[PDB]
């Protein structure tokens, strides 16, 4: 079974260069064409280039010339991808992508999970995490809304689960906000049976991989 | 480079409607090929060679087209349908793709419940306090926000997010965040976000009084 492999978030400061990868598996990446893909935050896909790795030849869009290399190797069956004098425009989900060109129909046919490219000198920083209680001010028709804000971290993500994965119905976690500040701050909200509150916990597992943060907030009634 | 115009950029549907939409190519090419894409993940390979269903795809999808125009078909809307469909052609060099036709699910006007959430004490020890206005399972998306501090109107200290579409029921949520310091937050007394939405006959107001 074919698998594209993509290596792991990155946060690069402006003006330095950034290598990405994606391990094939599953088929002989001489065989089809490695192709790179840019998606920015909240906008479309942009085709960087592409190489060949059966001849080593490569293309690119014209924008990208100077600002990306593509290599490949043959024997670890690996695409890479390097940029150069980072941006914040580099900031984006970067796509590995295959094609098997005129014998395999051309199209994208498999596709990597993406790389998260984040261009900043600053240095990580763990949020803290704060309950939202539930009270006689979040309550309706026999349920209750709780949550927990994780204020102040960067770069993104954070994960947020309730009660290590056991509450999922009725959970919203909101998409991070960017504070004036420069850090970001999320909500997660769950709304359950206004009879539980006194006889089940409620927690919210959160994890910050960047700055190997977890922390779990035990969210308790407020009877105002 | 060829140039690639998706329309409508945004568009919505109920389960069962017919669904179809557009891509224009600002010169002539062979075949065009199309794209689903979901939030958070990676796109997936959905029409080929104009015509084809990708592996996977149902029978409902269907794509058409010639020359400078072609057009991707749903018979019959799925809730699992909603996405981003990007086309993408591979006459001419460099490769290009359209900016996507966000397909979104229609249902009947929803109004908000609106819940606020006083900050924690814990927080208060670090010399801020956070103010939380949740607004939750609205439909259309569109929504105001207003937050009064002793009813003085709130700017420029706030924060706001609204989730996706919920594919269970088609509705938004939005979550609202005041950000003032401790300072501040404990010369005033009464709290409260101003809701205003198409759902509602007049704006809902809820609100606390500090320290109660
Ligand atoms: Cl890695
Ligand atoms: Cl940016
Ligand atoms: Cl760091
Ligand atoms: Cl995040
Ligand atoms: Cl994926």
């Known amino acids: 079974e074919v698998q594209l492999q993509q290596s792991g978030a990155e946060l690069v400061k402006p003006g330095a260069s950034v290598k990405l990868s994606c391990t094939a598996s599953?088929?002989?990446?001489?065989?089809?064409?490695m192709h790179w893909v840019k998606q920015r935050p909240e906008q479309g896909l942009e085709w960087i280039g592409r190489?060949?790795?059966?001849?080593?030849?490569?293309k690119y869009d014209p924008k990208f010339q100077g600002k990306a290399t593509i290599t490949a190797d043959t024997s670890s069956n690996t695409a890479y991808l390097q940029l150069s004098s980072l941006t914040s425009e580099d900031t984006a989900v970067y796509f590995c992508?295959?094609?098997?060109?005129?014998?395999?129909?051309?199209?994208?046919?498999?596709w990597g999970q993406g790389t998260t490219l984040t261009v900043s000198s600053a240095s990580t920083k763990g949020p803290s995490v704060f309950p939202l209680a539930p009270s006689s001010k979040s309550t309706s028709g026999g349920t209750a809304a709780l949550g927990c804000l994780v204020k102040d971290y960067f770069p993104e993500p954070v994960t947020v689960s309730w009660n290590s994965g056991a509450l999922t119905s009725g959970v919203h976690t909101f998409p991070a906000v960017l504070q004036s500040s420069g850090l970001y701050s999320l909500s997660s909200v769950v709304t359950v049976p206004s009879s539980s509150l006194g006889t089940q916990t409620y927690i919210c597992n959160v994890n910050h991989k960047p700055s190997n943060t977890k922390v779990d907030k035990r969210v308790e009634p407020k009877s105002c | 480079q060829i140039v690639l115009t998706q329309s409508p950029a945004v568009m919505s549907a109920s389960p069962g409607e017919r669904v179809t939409m557009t891509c224009s190519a600002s010169?002539?090419?062979?075949?065009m090929y199309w794209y689903q894409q979901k939030p958070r993940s990676s796109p997936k390979p959905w029409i080929y060679?104009?015509?084809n269903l990708a592996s996977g795809v149902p029978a409902r999808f269907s794509g058409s087209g010639s020359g400078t125009s072609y057009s991707l078909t749903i018979s019959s809307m799925e809730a699992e349908d909603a996405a981003t469909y990007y086309c993408?052609?591979?006459?001419?060099?460099?490769?290009?793709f359209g900016a996507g036709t966000k397909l979104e699910l229609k249902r009947t006007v929803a109004a908000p419940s609106v819940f606020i959430f006083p900050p924690s004490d814990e927080q208060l020890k670090s010399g801020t306090a956070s103010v939380v206005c949740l607004l939750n399972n609205f439909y259309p998306r569109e929504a105001k926000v207003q937050w009064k501090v002793d009813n003085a109107l709130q700017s420029g200290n706030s924060q706001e997010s609204v989730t996706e579409q919920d594919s269970k029921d088609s509705t938004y949520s939005l979550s609202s965040t005041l950000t003032l310091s401790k300072a501040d937050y404990e010369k005033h007394k009464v709290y409260a976000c101003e809701v205003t939405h198409q759902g509602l006959s007049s704006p809902v107001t809820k609100s606390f009084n500090r320290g109660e």
């Open positions: 060679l104009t015509s």
């Open positions: 993408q052609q591979w006459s001419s060099i460099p490769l290009t």
């Open positions: 992508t295959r094609s098997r060109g005129y014998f395999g129909n051309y199209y994208f046919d498999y």
């Open positions: 599953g088929f002989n990446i001489k065989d089809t064409y």
């Open positions: 010169s002539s090419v062979s075949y």
């Open positions: 190489i060949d790795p059966a001849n080593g030849n490569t």
